[PDB]
Amino acid sequence: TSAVQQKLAALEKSSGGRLGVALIDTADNTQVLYRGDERFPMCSTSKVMAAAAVLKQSETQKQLLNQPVEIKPADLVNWNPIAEKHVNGTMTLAELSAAALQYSDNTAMNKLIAQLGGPGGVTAFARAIGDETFRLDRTEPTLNTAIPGDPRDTTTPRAMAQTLRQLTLGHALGETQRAQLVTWLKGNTTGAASIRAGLPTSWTVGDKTGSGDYGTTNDIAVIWPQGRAPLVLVTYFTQPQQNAESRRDVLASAARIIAEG
């Protein structure tokens, strides 16, 4: 019930939905949590785990990121902004990872899942790095159904914040791979209205957004304030109505509240 809690609780109450927040400050390893142990549909934020797991593979298969992967008409799903540009051609695994992370391409995510042996291979990597909460159960696009109470394709804010810190600031990946993940997250094109919109102008951000049914609107971010040790912030949001519209403003507002405490 620190000052931020009542403020985050008030934001949630004004929003009509369910808000989950987890912050980690690497300067002193303290944490702020709001519904930190409740499950939320991850939606596209799970693409970070899949991309990281492929990077882990490339620590042994050194040229793996350069491997071409055919894009067939049957591979296309519901949102394929980059993969649709390469049907009947190829994209490398690096290009598929970038398309997944920076444009939220769902065909690209499915190629990453396939490279890992299915959703259980993404969950396997989460276990290998100490995340016992993350579970990926479906491919795209069905992982976004975001049905209330459904444990499939969920994690908690606390678990995802620890994971993102290990991948981007810790040593869960090789240094080359960590740098590549950071470059990918910083190049994200879909995050301008989410966590980034609630943070000071001078802070560098890498993030992955998520969106799904029930108005589910998510963002997970690694944040470098200037003259200060980096931060990790997860903001998850979902709504009672299956048809609810996106609420990226809630994530911006949560980030601003966090950034003010």
Author numbering: 26 to 57, 59 to 238, 240 to 252, 254 to 289
Question: How does the study describe this entry?
Answer:
CTX-M β-lactamases are prevalent antibiotic resistance enzymes and are notable for their ability to rapidly hydrolyze the extended-spectrum cephalosporin, cefotaxime. The enzyme used in this study, CTX-M-14, is a member of the CTX-M-9 subgroup. CTX-M enzymes, like other class A enzymes, utilize a catalytic serine residue (Ser70) to attack the carbonyl carbon of the β-lactam ring, leading to the formation of a covalent, acyl-enzyme intermediate. In a subsequent deacylation step, residue Glu166 serves as a general base, activating a water molecule that attacks the carbonyl carbon of the ester bond of the acyl enzyme, releasing the hydrolyzed substrate and regenerating the enzyme.
The VNYN (103–106) loop contains residues Asn104, Tyr105, and Asn106 and is adjacent to the substrate binding pocket. In cefotaxime hydrolysis, Asn104 has been shown to form a hydrogen bond with the substrate and facilitate cefotaxime hydrolysis, and Tyr105 interacts with cefotaxime through hydrophobic interactions. A handful of residues—Tyr105, Asn106, Gly238, Asp240, and Arg276—can tolerate some substitutions and retain high levels of ampicillin and cefotaxime hydrolysis. Amino acid substitutions that are predicted to have high catalytic activity based on the sequencing results were introduced at positions Tyr105, Asn106, and Asp240, and the modified enzymes were purified. Tyr105, which makes hydrophobic interactions with β-lactam substrates once bound, can be substituted for other aromatic side chains—tryptophan or phenylalanine—with no predicted impact on enzyme activity and resistance. The antibiotic resistance levels of E. coli containing the Y105W mutant were tested, and the mutant exhibited no significant change (defined as a fourfold or larger change in MIC) against ampicillin or cefotaxime. Moreover, the turnover rate (kcat) and catalytic efficiency (kcat/KM) for both substrates were similar to those of the wildtype. We have also identified a residue that can be freely substituted (Asp240) and residues that can adopt a conservative range of mutations (Tyr105, Asn106, Gly238, and Arg276) while retaining penicillin and cefotaxime activity.
